[PDB]
């Protein structure tokens, strides 16, 4: 139907790409994948409870941390129930089910439900109220729980629209480029890879690098055709430099298990390790990109389906190897050991990554034995879920579908709250998949379609890449389409509002950027120019309201144009403010959002996420370092939005406000806090909060290798919560930022002591070692982060930093000592590094 034609047109607009396009393809994998995702979608759609899906309660099964029970030493919790001008205050017990307090209400005073005031957040479903995230959020922030009694959302609104033993060889015909301007020479390198491991390599003779270079030469490999593993890539690379200029990959076995065959003309990617180098997609730009032509002329297949010792010491060698971190390599010895004692290895879940890296994927018989091994997976299937281990089997080192699937199998058992914690990283992992359709892609579909909060962020995480990654936009686009076709008309409506809004603000942001980037000042002309442009949108163009992308529970209404402006910084980001479109809101406070161009916010997203992960880690040990991972969503190339934290200022601005400019007085910070503090109570609270938050970010920032900072890049709220920002990496050195002013707040100085500083040192050590208790998880998150977003990755030194930072190996005692020394290095440096941040 044209109705279908228009629909697909609406989908294209939400996605930012066209899955019906075939301009940059050489086979039907994408189309095959669209069709293949149909079943996964429909099966989850039909499976989800219409009522719970509409209300998406946000719950956790994790225990209430010790530091939160402190605020409840009476087994009673106060919920403020509203209904217009009314507002009671029903006392409740932490294990009181929701529906069983509306009963300690209705009767204490029925087709209703408890909804948070001013938010699209509901407190329903059979769950202790203490297990609801919003309730833990309020408690952790000493806020009161205000709810409004109203009618459940109509699930009718989520309606889904009806729907050979020869040696392998490859002939390199030649390369061609429109124009490729000191001259030099070139050659072609054809590699057979699997899980980033060259099984075979062949090269051509060095030749003249001209707009057209031919060889018409067969490159014969030693490996046999019926030995090629499913998921093996034929990697073609061009070398010039009188080194690597262009690369392109072709899956040797397709999505149907067939051996690739025929003529191919592949448009390559130019180099300006990482995930982009592994893509099966070809450069879309067929007009001004390099291309290579090859000939392939050569029947997949299939699947069906111990006793002895492990001498004392050899077992000791095995356990030693197993205990090493994910970055500790594997000697051929290690590999042969792991493999020979295959069945002993299978009894240790942590041995799995090392084990499979020990498999000779280029040997049919061996791989065959591997599957046989995974057949008896009893131990693995019964192991306690380890996200760190699971993620390792999903990274660039594993290309085998069955190996990766057991990883996904393990993810299946994660509760929605945990999926949210790792969603960005799981989405990024899709880049390591050899085929578009994959167990991991289907898992993201299932979970997204099953819960609205996960589906919302999945949308934006996917759109973020589809809008700026030529290497993966196609794959992600198909997966996003699949999701949109099953999320519901309601959500489709919401995404439509959100996209039109951010797409308008992006235009403004950029145009204003042009009338600026003049050298700072930010003219009134430029601000006048802004207000005029916003005025235009404020009319029949900017929807009445829209959900805040990084905080789906919040609905933003009309722009407070009078409060909007252009910030006085290198980049000229917009500082917008909106009124909350929710009357039941508990305030008149506007929603502040910063729209900026100039920075790659994909990096910021990644760090902010690992920051939340570090929080959950600290929780599992009763710690609360008070981090502050504000919302941030990359919406396009060097552009995106950021949440405006209320009542906070840059530590640089605090300094400038007193010294005027440059310096650097030690008490400025303490003054500021006191002045922003009225009651003495609040401040002795704020200084406390500053000690925790400072510790948190010093530890966090040190582990991630981004501690050496810049005063203008770290802020503080009037309530004492410190927090870094901008992760744009303009960064002698220092492990982190613990300058004199910070110390002054802690009450010490000039290298001395104080209750606090000692409270600070105590918190840091506890936090540091608590992270070391998840060394593997962090190591794997760190390296994935570096490969999918910080395109500045030496598959060695860079990734290795976190090993050293986590002080891998050594013991707890030497670890604690190690960090305390770092704290000292900051003390010896004082203001030197800070000051040096200008030359």
GROMACS .gro file of N, CA and C in nm, residues 263-373:
model
  333
  263UNK      N    1   3.271  -1.157  -0.955
  263UNK     CA    2   3.345  -1.033  -0.978
  263UNK      C    3   3.308  -0.932  -0.871
  264UNK      N    4   3.404  -0.858  -0.818
  264UNK     CA    5   3.371  -0.758  -0.717
  264UNK      C    6   3.451  -0.631  -0.740
  265UNK      N    7   3.386  -0.517  -0.719
  265UNK     CA    8   3.452  -0.389  -0.733
  265UNK      C    9   3.417  -0.323  -0.602
  266UNK      N   10   3.516  -0.316  -0.513
  266UNK     CA   11   3.495  -0.262  -0.379
  266UNK      C   12   3.555  -0.124  -0.353
  267UNK      N   13   3.469  -0.032  -0.311
  267UNK     CA   14   3.512   0.103  -0.279
  267UNK      C   15   3.559   0.105  -0.136
  268UNK      N   16   3.686   0.139  -0.123
  268UNK     CA   17   3.755   0.137   0.004
  268UNK      C   18   3.746   0.258   0.093
  269UNK      N   19   3.791   0.238   0.216
  269UNK     CA   20   3.794   0.342   0.318
  269UNK      C   21   3.937   0.390   0.327
  270UNK      N   22   3.953   0.521   0.334
  270UNK     CA   23   4.084   0.581   0.343
  270UNK      C   24   4.117   0.604   0.489
  271UNK      N   25   4.242   0.572   0.523
  271UNK     CA   26   4.292   0.590   0.659
  271UNK      C   27   4.321   0.738   0.676
  272UNK      N   28   4.287   0.792   0.792
  272UNK     CA   29   4.313   0.934   0.816
  272UNK      C   30   4.450   0.957   0.878
  273UNK      N   31   4.324  -0.307   1.617
  273UNK     CA   32   4.308  -0.164   1.638
  273UNK      C   33   4.161  -0.133   1.665
  274UNK      N   34   4.104  -0.041   1.587
  274UNK     CA   35   3.964  -0.003   1.606
  274UNK      C   36   3.860  -0.077   1.522
  275UNK      N   37   3.736  -0.065   1.569
  275UNK     CA   38   3.619  -0.127   1.510
  275UNK      C   39   3.588  -0.095   1.363
  276UNK      N   40   3.613   0.028   1.318
  276UNK     CA   41   3.581   0.058   1.179
  276UNK      C   42   3.660  -0.030   1.081
  277UNK      N   43   3.782  -0.068   1.119
  277UNK     CA   44   3.862  -0.151   1.030
  277UNK      C   45   3.806  -0.291   1.007
  278UNK      N   46   3.704  -0.329   1.082
  278UNK     CA   47   3.649  -0.464   1.068
  278UNK      C   48   3.522  -0.473   0.986
  279UNK      N   49   3.471  -0.358   0.939
  279UNK     CA   50   3.343  -0.355   0.867
  279UNK      C   51   3.336  -0.417   0.728
  280UNK      N   52   3.222  -0.482   0.702
  280UNK     CA   53   3.195  -0.547   0.575
  280UNK      C   54   3.132  -0.448   0.478
  281UNK      N   55   3.100  -0.329   0.529
  281UNK     CA   56   3.041  -0.227   0.446
  281UNK      C   57   3.150  -0.165   0.358
  282UNK      N   58   3.111  -0.118   0.239
  282UNK     CA   59   3.204  -0.053   0.146
  282UNK      C   60   3.175   0.097   0.146
  283UNK      N   61   3.274   0.178   0.109
  283UNK     CA   62   3.257   0.324   0.106
  283UNK      C   63   3.136   0.364   0.015
  284UNK      N   64   3.037   0.438   0.070
  284UNK     CA   65   2.918   0.482  -0.004
  284UNK      C   66   2.953   0.573  -0.120
  285UNK      N   67   3.054   0.654  -0.096
  285UNK     CA   68   3.101   0.750  -0.193
  285UNK      C   69   3.170   0.680  -0.308
  286UNK      N   70   3.095   0.642  -0.410
  286UNK     CA   71   3.154   0.573  -0.523
  286UNK      C   72   3.226   0.665  -0.621
  287UNK      N   73   3.203   0.796  -0.610
  287UNK     CA   74   3.261   0.892  -0.702
  287UNK      C   75   3.406   0.934  -0.681
  288UNK      N   76   3.450   0.962  -0.558
  288UNK     CA   77   3.586   1.006  -0.534
  288UNK      C   78   3.665   0.916  -0.438
  289UNK      N   79   3.624   0.787  -0.429
  289UNK     CA   80   3.695   0.693  -0.341
  289UNK      C   81   3.774   0.590  -0.420
  290UNK      N   82   3.875   0.533  -0.355
  290UNK     CA   83   3.959   0.430  -0.415
  290UNK      C   84   3.882   0.300  -0.428
  291UNK      N   85   3.911   0.223  -0.531
  291UNK     CA   86   3.839   0.098  -0.547
  291UNK      C   87   3.936  -0.011  -0.590
  292UNK      N   88   3.900  -0.134  -0.561
  292UNK     CA   89   3.982  -0.248  -0.597
  292UNK      C   90   3.885  -0.348  -0.660
  293UNK      N   91   3.930  -0.414  -0.766
  293UNK     CA   92   3.846  -0.511  -0.836
  293UNK      C   93   3.912  -0.645  -0.821
  294UNK      N   94   3.834  -0.748  -0.793
  294UNK     CA   95   3.892  -0.881  -0.775
  294UNK      C   96   3.800  -0.987  -0.835
  295UNK      N   97   3.854  -1.108  -0.849
  295UNK     CA   98   3.775  -1.219  -0.901
  295UNK      C   99   3.782  -1.335  -0.806
  296UNK      N  100   3.665  -1.389  -0.775
  296UNK     CA  101   3.655  -1.501  -0.684
  296UNK      C  102   3.585  -1.615  -0.757
  297UNK      N  103   3.653  -1.729  -0.767
  297UNK     CA  104   3.596  -1.846  -0.833
  297UNK      C  105   3.638  -1.976  -0.765
  298UNK      N  106   3.550  -2.031  -0.681
  298UNK     CA  107   3.575  -2.155  -0.607
  298UNK      C  108   3.442  -2.228  -0.581
  299UNK      N  109   2.947  -2.371  -0.099
  299UNK     CA  110   2.953  -2.505  -0.043
  299UNK      C  111   3.008  -2.496   0.092
  300UNK      N  112   2.925  -2.453   0.193
  300UNK     CA  113   2.944  -2.430   0.341
  300UNK      C  114   2.926  -2.566   0.399
  301UNK      N  115   2.849  -2.542   0.518
  301UNK     CA  116   2.807  -2.664   0.583
  301UNK      C  117   2.756  -2.676   0.717
  302UNK      N  118   2.798  -2.786   0.777
  302UNK     CA  119   2.728  -2.800   0.895
  302UNK      C  120   2.755  -2.843   1.030
  303UNK      N  121   2.646  -2.855   1.105
  303UNK     CA  122   2.652  -2.889   1.245
  303UNK      C  123   2.557  -2.997   1.291
  304UNK      N  124   2.612  -3.090   1.359
  304UNK     CA  125   2.538  -3.191   1.437
  304UNK      C  126   2.607  -3.211   1.571
  305UNK      N  127   2.624  -3.340   1.618
  305UNK     CA  128   2.692  -3.386   1.740
  305UNK      C  129   2.623  -3.509   1.800
  306UNK      N  130   3.755  -3.705   2.680
  306UNK     CA  131   3.823  -3.685   2.808
  306UNK      C  132   3.865  -3.817   2.873
  307UNK      N  133   3.860  -3.823   3.006
  307UNK     CA  134   3.905  -3.940   3.084
  307UNK      C  135   4.057  -3.920   3.083
  308UNK      N  136   4.124  -3.912   3.191
  308UNK     CA  137   4.268  -3.884   3.213
  308UNK      C  138   4.284  -3.763   3.304
  309UNK      N  139   4.418  -3.752   3.337
  309UNK     CA  140   4.467  -3.647   3.425
  309UNK      C  141   4.512  -3.515   3.370
  310UNK      N  142   4.563  -3.437   3.463
  310UNK     CA  143   4.622  -3.308   3.436
  310UNK      C  144   4.716  -3.310   3.555
  311UNK      N  145   4.840  -3.357   3.530
  311UNK     CA  146   4.950  -3.369   3.626
  311UNK      C  147   4.955  -3.248   3.714
  312UNK      N  148   4.993  -3.266   3.839
  312UNK     CA  149   4.999  -3.154   3.931
  312UNK      C  150   5.051  -3.020   3.878
  313UNK      N  151   5.177  -3.012   3.841
  313UNK     CA  152   5.229  -2.885   3.795
  313UNK      C  153   5.171  -2.828   3.668
  314UNK      N  154   5.137  -2.913   3.572
  314UNK     CA  155   5.081  -2.857   3.449
  314UNK      C  156   4.950  -2.787   3.483
  315UNK      N  157   4.879  -2.837   3.583
  315UNK     CA  158   4.754  -2.774   3.625
  315UNK      C  159   4.784  -2.638   3.688
  316UNK      N  160   4.899  -2.628   3.751
  316UNK     CA  161   4.940  -2.504   3.812
  316UNK      C  162   4.971  -2.404   3.702
  317UNK      N  163   5.030  -2.450   3.591
  317UNK     CA  164   5.061  -2.359   3.481
  317UNK      C  165   4.931  -2.307   3.422
  318UNK      N  166   4.833  -2.397   3.411
  318UNK     CA  167   4.701  -2.368   3.355
  318UNK      C  168   4.629  -2.263   3.438
  319UNK      N  169   4.624  -2.282   3.569
  319UNK     CA  170   4.558  -2.187   3.658
  319UNK      C  171   4.626  -2.052   3.659
  320UNK      N  172   4.758  -2.051   3.642
  320UNK     CA  173   4.831  -1.926   3.638
  320UNK      C  174   4.784  -1.845   3.516
  321UNK      N  175   4.782  -1.912   3.400
  321UNK     CA  176   4.739  -1.854   3.273
  321UNK      C  177   4.595  -1.802   3.286
  322UNK      N  178   4.509  -1.882   3.350
  322UNK     CA  179   4.369  -1.845   3.369
  322UNK      C  180   4.351  -1.723   3.454
  323UNK      N  181   4.440  -1.705   3.550
  323UNK     CA  182   4.427  -1.592   3.640
  323UNK      C  183   4.473  -1.458   3.584
  324UNK      N  184   4.550  -1.461   3.476
  324UNK     CA  185   4.601  -1.339   3.415
  324UNK      C  186   4.488  -1.248   3.366
  325UNK      N  187   4.513  -1.118   3.352
  325UNK     CA  188   4.408  -1.028   3.306
  325UNK      C  189   4.379  -1.052   3.156
  326UNK      N  190   4.270  -0.995   3.103
  326UNK     CA  191   4.233  -1.010   2.962
  326UNK      C  192   4.337  -0.957   2.865
  327UNK      N  193   4.431  -0.875   2.912
  327UNK     CA  194   4.532  -0.822   2.822
  327UNK      C  195   4.663  -0.898   2.822
  328UNK      N  196   4.676  -0.992   2.916
  328UNK     CA  197   4.797  -1.074   2.924
  328UNK      C  198   4.781  -1.174   2.811
  329UNK      N  199   4.861  -1.161   2.704
  329UNK     CA  200   4.864  -1.244   2.581
  329UNK      C  201   4.850  -1.393   2.601
  330UNK      N  202   4.911  -1.467   2.509
  330UNK     CA  203   4.913  -1.611   2.513
  330UNK      C  204   5.021  -1.663   2.425
  331UNK      N  205   5.120  -1.720   2.490
  331UNK     CA  206   5.231  -1.781   2.424
  331UNK      C  207   5.178  -1.905   2.352
  332UNK      N  208   5.247  -1.948   2.248
  332UNK     CA  209   5.206  -2.069   2.180
  332UNK      C  210   5.195  -2.175   2.290
  333UNK      N  211   5.282  -2.173   2.391
  333UNK     CA  212   5.272  -2.277   2.493
  333UNK      C  213   5.140  -2.272   2.561
  334UNK      N  214   5.105  -2.152   2.605
  334UNK     CA  215   4.980  -2.131   2.672
  334UNK      C  216   4.869  -2.192   2.588
  335UNK      N  217   4.865  -2.155   2.460
  335UNK     CA  218   4.764  -2.205   2.369
  335UNK      C  219   4.754  -2.354   2.356
  336UNK      N  220   4.868  -2.420   2.341
  336UNK     CA  221   4.869  -2.565   2.326
  336UNK      C  222   4.823  -2.631   2.456
  337UNK      N  223   4.854  -2.567   2.568
  337UNK     CA  224   4.814  -2.621   2.698
  337UNK      C  225   4.662  -2.613   2.710
  338UNK      N  226   4.610  -2.490   2.695
  338UNK     CA  227   4.467  -2.465   2.701
  338UNK      C  228   4.392  -2.564   2.609
  339UNK      N  229   4.444  -2.584   2.488
  339UNK     CA  230   4.381  -2.673   2.391
  339UNK      C  231   4.391  -2.821   2.425
  340UNK      N  232   4.509  -2.864   2.466
  340UNK     CA  233   4.527  -3.004   2.498
  340UNK      C  234   4.442  -3.042   2.617
  341UNK      N  235   4.435  -2.952   2.713
  341UNK     CA  236   4.356  -2.977   2.832
  341UNK      C  237   4.224  -2.901   2.820
  342UNK      N  238   4.169  -2.913   2.700
  342UNK     CA  239   4.042  -2.857   2.656
  342UNK      C  240   3.930  -2.880   2.758
  343UNK      N  241   3.919  -3.004   2.803
  343UNK     CA  242   3.814  -3.040   2.896
  343UNK      C  243   3.841  -2.996   3.038
  344UNK      N  244   3.965  -2.966   3.070
  344UNK     CA  245   3.992  -2.920   3.204
  344UNK      C  246   3.959  -2.772   3.202
  345UNK      N  247   3.997  -2.708   3.092
  345UNK     CA  248   3.972  -2.567   3.070
  345UNK      C  249   3.823  -2.535   3.077
  346UNK      N  250   3.741  -2.624   3.021
  346UNK     CA  251   3.597  -2.606   3.018
  346UNK      C  252   3.532  -2.599   3.156
  347UNK      N  253   3.607  -2.630   3.260
  347UNK     CA  254   3.549  -2.627   3.394
  347UNK      C  255   3.569  -2.493   3.463
  348UNK      N  256   3.634  -2.401   3.393
  348UNK     CA  257   3.662  -2.271   3.450
  348UNK      C  258   3.611  -2.166   3.354
  349UNK      N  259   3.495  -2.103   3.384
  349UNK     CA  260   3.436  -1.999   3.301
  349UNK      C  261   3.532  -1.887   3.263
  350UNK      N  262   3.617  -1.846   3.356
  350UNK     CA  263   3.711  -1.740   3.325
  350UNK      C  264   3.815  -1.783   3.222
  351UNK      N  265   3.821  -1.913   3.193
  351UNK     CA  266   3.918  -1.966   3.098
  351UNK      C  267   3.868  -1.960   2.956
  352UNK      N  268   3.738  -1.940   2.940
  352UNK     CA  269   3.681  -1.936   2.808
  352UNK      C  270   3.741  -1.843   2.706
  353UNK      N  271   3.764  -1.715   2.740
  353UNK     CA  272   3.823  -1.625   2.640
  353UNK      C  273   3.960  -1.675   2.594
  354UNK      N  274   4.046  -1.708   2.690
  354UNK     CA  275   4.180  -1.757   2.660
  354UNK      C  276   4.172  -1.885   2.576
  355UNK      N  277   4.083  -1.975   2.617
  355UNK     CA  278   4.064  -2.103   2.549
  355UNK      C  279   4.035  -2.096   2.400
  356UNK      N  280   3.937  -2.014   2.363
  356UNK     CA  281   3.897  -1.998   2.224
  356UNK      C  282   3.995  -1.920   2.142
  357UNK      N  283   4.080  -1.842   2.208
  357UNK     CA  284   4.184  -1.769   2.138
  357UNK      C  285   4.293  -1.873   2.111
  358UNK      N  286   4.276  -1.990   2.170
  358UNK     CA  287   4.372  -2.098   2.153
  358UNK      C  288   4.331  -2.193   2.042
  359UNK      N  289   4.210  -2.174   1.989
  359UNK     CA  290   4.160  -2.258   1.881
  359UNK      C  291   4.221  -2.216   1.748
  360UNK      N  292   4.252  -2.316   1.664
  360UNK     CA  293   4.308  -2.291   1.531
  360UNK      C  294   4.186  -2.284   1.441
  361UNK      N  295   4.129  -2.164   1.429
  361UNK     CA  296   4.008  -2.144   1.350
  361UNK      C  297   4.026  -2.175   1.202
  362UNK      N  298   4.150  -2.168   1.155
  362UNK     CA  299   4.178  -2.200   1.016
  362UNK      C  300   4.185  -2.350   0.987
  363UNK      N  301   4.151  -2.436   1.083
  363UNK     CA  302   4.152  -2.581   1.060
  363UNK      C  303   4.015  -2.641   1.082
  364UNK      N  304   3.952  -2.686   0.974
  364UNK     CA  305   3.817  -2.743   0.983
  364UNK      C  306   3.798  -2.841   1.098
  365UNK      N  307   3.887  -2.940   1.106
  365UNK     CA  308   3.881  -3.043   1.210
  365UNK      C  309   3.885  -2.991   1.352
  366UNK      N  310   3.973  -2.894   1.377
  366UNK     CA  311   3.985  -2.836   1.510
  366UNK      C  312   3.857  -2.760   1.549
  367UNK      N  313   3.809  -2.674   1.460
  367UNK     CA  314   3.687  -2.597   1.485
  367UNK      C  315   3.577  -2.698   1.518
  368UNK      N  316   3.575  -2.804   1.439
  368UNK     CA  317   3.477  -2.911   1.455
  368UNK      C  318   3.483  -2.960   1.600
  369UNK      N  319   3.603  -2.988   1.648
  369UNK     CA  320   3.620  -3.035   1.786
  369UNK      C  321   3.575  -2.931   1.888
  370UNK      N  322   3.590  -2.804   1.851
  370UNK     CA  323   3.550  -2.691   1.936
  370UNK      C  324   3.398  -2.696   1.958
  371UNK      N  325   3.321  -2.704   1.850
  371UNK     CA  326   3.176  -2.712   1.865
  371UNK      C  327   3.136  -2.830   1.952
  372UNK      N  328   3.207  -2.941   1.936
  372UNK     CA  329   3.180  -3.060   2.014
  372UNK      C  330   3.200  -3.022   2.160
  373UNK      N  331   3.303  -2.942   2.185
  373UNK     CA  332   3.334  -2.895   2.318
  373UNK      C  333   3.219  -2.812   2.376
   0.00000   0.00000   0.00000
